[PDB]
């Protein structure tokens, strides 16, 4: 059933045995039984084999052991019984084996240890007791063992350690007690453990720093974390000089002694986080083997200048969330690699601060108040790969010896507007720059976060030559025909009717829109091929604000004056005394256009979204601050006069419309309003586009029709008027008569 190794070794795995195997050679040396179904051990089960050395009973459910069953095994060395179903430590059947070496009792639900247990074992060296349900340390059975080396009691339910627990263990080397529920430690609990090297107390509920550790003279590695320790008194580590590793994290530490960490001749790393009230740098005299130093969350304001004159082998350095104001020189250091200084009050950089660090790779100085950086700062600094400096008021950024850089982030430095030289950064992989136009110099595989897409072009503002000539065309004739029509309507020395003065104001508003378009065309013509250079200055200056205000103002006056024109016509027909009434209404509407245009100016960043200074296209996120409001006002008005004119259609018949000159005026107004409706639908649709997730159009296209479909009325309204109202011809003859009389 079980194979024979030939060297006196017998192995049994999952062969369904409920009793001890028999018939094997009496000279076998090692016996393993695992995964079978033995539940009880009969008396004199192992009397057959007198030369057994190592004994494995793994995984089966043994529950009862006869006291005399284990007798006769005087040479047994290793005994393993884990994951079985014993409930108490077998004080009997164990006293016989004098020459036992290692004993493993894991995963067995054990609650009580008999007093006379572990008696007669004179040379036991390893004893494993974890994952059980122990509730108090077996002081007497432990004292019974004088030659124990390694002790593990983990995951048990111990609550407190009484005094003089481990007096008689002279040669104990390592002690593991983690995940227990210890909360109090006596001052003399650990006496006698002179040769203890490793001490583990993790995840316990310690509420105050223990003192008994000062009795240990040769404690190498010490680990406690996730506890509730909050205060580190000075002189704590005085007793034990040699400490390679100190584990502490997740503790809610508040105060740490000035001289606590002093005179540790062999400590390797030091980490302190969350210690808020500590405000003065620790005294590190005598510690000359510190690879890594980390202090976070404190109130430190200054740094000693002998720091790495002492620390000759420091490799990394991080100091963030402090109140550091000035930086002492780091010239002495040679092995320093990574430096992090964030959320501090640094405001200037000097040449000498970073001089002499040969092997510095990663440098971070983010979220500070630095505004002055010397040109020669970074000049003789060695090969540096990743440099991050952002969210600081910075005016000019030098570049000397940065050719080896790979990662460079500068975002939030709105004061920085100078372009970036492409030749210097030869091996740059990832950029972050505050304004998208700067990346146009690289024209990128370089990665620049800012989108620098169509809405923010590099070479031409208007893009296509056809679009350029088209806007040039409507600009011109809008201007010329608007001037002609206003001269015809106003220069005549005749009484001015309400409708005539109304169309005059229409002409004035359309003229304003036209020279807004003209100023845009002038900018495009001037900045041909090099828009990237001028973009930042143009958007930041007041010109963009002026242009946007002009456009917005021109577009509201036209709409409101048209609405007032068609109710003027409606009630004029109806009374067929409101002339002065409507004149000041027109004035009041002009004032409203003025204030509506100037309202966004007091806000921040509303007019700088696009180089065109028109907010209605918006962008990635215009987040409808007032765009939705404006389109709502425009649509509601249009539907109002749509209803008004439908009512007029119902009231007055078509034959009277054909035979009435006032109705010819009505037809002209109807043409005007219909044109205004269809030419304003597209911009409203574009503003509604981001609200719907399904619809998406390329910035190429939305820019083109936003450019084309905005100013058309300023062009066709005067053309419509002169082409289809002989009223203009009559005024033309009148002004010809006046000119002939003058000349």
């Amino acid at each position: 059933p079980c194979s024979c190794d030939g060297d006196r070794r017998v192995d049994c795995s999952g062969k369904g045995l409920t009793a001890v195997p028999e018939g094997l050679s009496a000279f076998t040396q090692a016996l393993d039984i695992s995964m079978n179904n033995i539940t009880q051990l009969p008396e004199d089960a192992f009397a057959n084999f007198p030369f057994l050395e190592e004994l494995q009973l793994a995984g089966n459910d043994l529950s009862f052991i006869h006291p005399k069953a284990l007798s006769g095994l005087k040479e047994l060395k290793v005994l393993t019984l884990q994951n079985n179903q014993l409930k108490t430590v077998p004080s009997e059947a164990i006293r016989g084996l004098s020459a036992l070496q290692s004993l493993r009792l894991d995963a067995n639900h054990i609650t009580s240890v008999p007093e006379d247990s572990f008696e007669g074992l004179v040379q036991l060296r390893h004893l494993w007791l974890d994952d059980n349900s122990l509730t108090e340390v077996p002081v007497h059975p432990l004292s019974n063992l004088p030659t124990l080396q390694a002790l593990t009691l983990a995951l048990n339910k111990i609550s407190s350690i009484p005094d003089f627990a481990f007096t008689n263990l002279s040669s104990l080397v390592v002690l593991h007690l983690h995940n227990n529920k210890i909360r109090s430690l006596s001052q003399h609990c650990f006496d006698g453990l002179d040769n203890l090297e490793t001490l583990d107390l993790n995840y316990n509920n310690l509420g105050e720093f223990p003192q008994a550790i000062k009795a240990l003279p040769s404690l190498k590695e010490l680990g406690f974390h996730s506890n509730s320790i909050s205060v580190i008194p000075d002189g704590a580590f005085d007793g034990n000089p040699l400490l390679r590793t100190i584990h502490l994290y997740d503790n809610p530490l508040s105060f740490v002694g000035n001289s606590a960490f002093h005179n540790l001749s062999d400590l390797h790393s030091l980490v302190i986080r969350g210690a808020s009230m500590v405000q003065q740098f620790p005294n590190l005299t005598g510690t000359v083997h510190l690879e890594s130093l980390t202090l976070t969350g404190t109130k430190i304001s200054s740094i000693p200048n002998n720091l790495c004159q002492e620390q000759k082998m420091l490799r990394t350095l991080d100091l963030s969330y402090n109140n550091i104001r000035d930086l002492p020189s780091f010239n002495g250091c040679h092995a320093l690699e990574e430096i992090s200084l964030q959320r501090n009050q640094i405001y200037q950089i000097k040449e000498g601060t970073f001089q002499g660090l040969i092997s510095l790779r990663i440098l971070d100085l983010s979220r500070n108040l630095i505004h002055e950086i010397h040109s020669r700062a970074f000049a003789t600094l060695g090969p540096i790969t990743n440099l991050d400096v952002s969210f600081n008021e910075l005016t000019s950024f030098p570049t000397e010896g940065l050719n080896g850089l790979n990662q460079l982030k500068l975002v939030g430095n709105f004061k920085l507007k100078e372009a970036l030289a492409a030749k210097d950064f030869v091996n740059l992989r990832s950029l972050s720059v505050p304004y998208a136009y700067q990346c146009c110099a690289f024209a990128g595989i370089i990665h620049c976060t800012p989108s620098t897409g169509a809405f923010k072009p590099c070479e031409y503002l208007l893009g296509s030559w056809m679009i350029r000539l088209t806007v040039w065309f409507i600009f011109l004739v809008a201007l010329f025909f608007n001037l002609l029509v206003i001269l015809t309507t106003f220069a005549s020395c005749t009484s001015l009717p309400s409708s005539k003065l109304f169309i005059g104001l229409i002409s004035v508003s359309n003229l304003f829109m036209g020279i807004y378009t003209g100023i845009l065309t002038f900018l495009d013509a001037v900045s041909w091929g090099r828009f990237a250079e001028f973009g930042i200055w143009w958007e930041t200056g007041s010109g963009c604000k002026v242009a946007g205000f002009l456009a917005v103002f021109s577009s509201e006056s036209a709409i409101f004056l048209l609405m007032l024109a068609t109710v003027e016509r409606s009630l004029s027909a109806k009374d067929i005394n409101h002339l002065k009434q409507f004149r000041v209404a027109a004035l009041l509407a002009f004032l409203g256009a003025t204030v509506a245009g100037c309202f966004p100016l007091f806000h921040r960043g509303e007019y700088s979204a696009s180089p065109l200074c028109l907010p209605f296209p918006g962008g990635e996120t215009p987040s409808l601050g007032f765009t939705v409001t404006l389109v709502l006002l425009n649509s509601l008005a249009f539907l109002l006069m749509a209803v008004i004119y439908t009512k007029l259609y119902c009231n007055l018949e078509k034959e009277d419309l054909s035979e009435n000159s006032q109705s010819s005026m009505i037809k002209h107004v109807a043409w005007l309003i219909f044109t205004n409706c269809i030419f304003f639908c597209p911009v409203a649709f574009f503003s509604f586009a981001p609200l719907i997730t399904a619809i998406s159009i390329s910035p190429e296209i939305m820019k083109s029709v936003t450019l084309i479909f905005f100013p058309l009325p300023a062009c066709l309204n005067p053309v419509l008027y002169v082409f289809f109202n002989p009223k203009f011809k009559e005024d033309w003859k009148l002004l010809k008569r006046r000119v002939t009389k003058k000349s």
Partner: nanobody
């Protein structure tokens, strides 16, 4: 004390592989073990580890299983659907103190190291 590993070799992409490590001794803490990956020209990195919620690396998430059997004191790591970037040398590391997940991205804490194996994926 002594650590030994078995497994490894050359496998076409998308295969499955099992790596088994055995340990002998008593000083090590059975609640801190890890598998470490090394590619030439770079320092060791921690692929996976057992802590007391196993710690898994960013990259190998969803394709790597780590298990421990204290019945026979063996550590198992099974991989499936490998990518060629997984071709490297593998180590088993055991500590002397209990450890958390935060201790696994720094190898210097671990002390007991194995001889290692080599696995290549095509």
């Amino acid at each position: 004390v002594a650590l030994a590993e078995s497994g490894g070799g050359s496998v076409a992409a998308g295969g499955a592989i099992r790596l088994s490590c055995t340990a002998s001794g008593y000083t090590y803490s059975k609640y801190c073990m890890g598998w470490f990956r090394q590619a030439p020209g770079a320092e060791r990195a921690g692929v996976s580890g057992i802590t007391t919620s196993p710690y898994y690396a960013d990259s190998v998430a969803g394709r790597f299983t780590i298990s421990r059997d204290n019945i026979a004191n063996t550590l198992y790591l099974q991989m499936n659907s490998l990518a060629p970037a997984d071709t490297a040398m593998y180590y088993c590391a055991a500590s002397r103190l209990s450890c958390s997940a935060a201790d696994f991205k720094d190898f210097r804490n671990f002390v007991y190291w194995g001889q290692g194996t080599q696995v290549t994926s095509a």
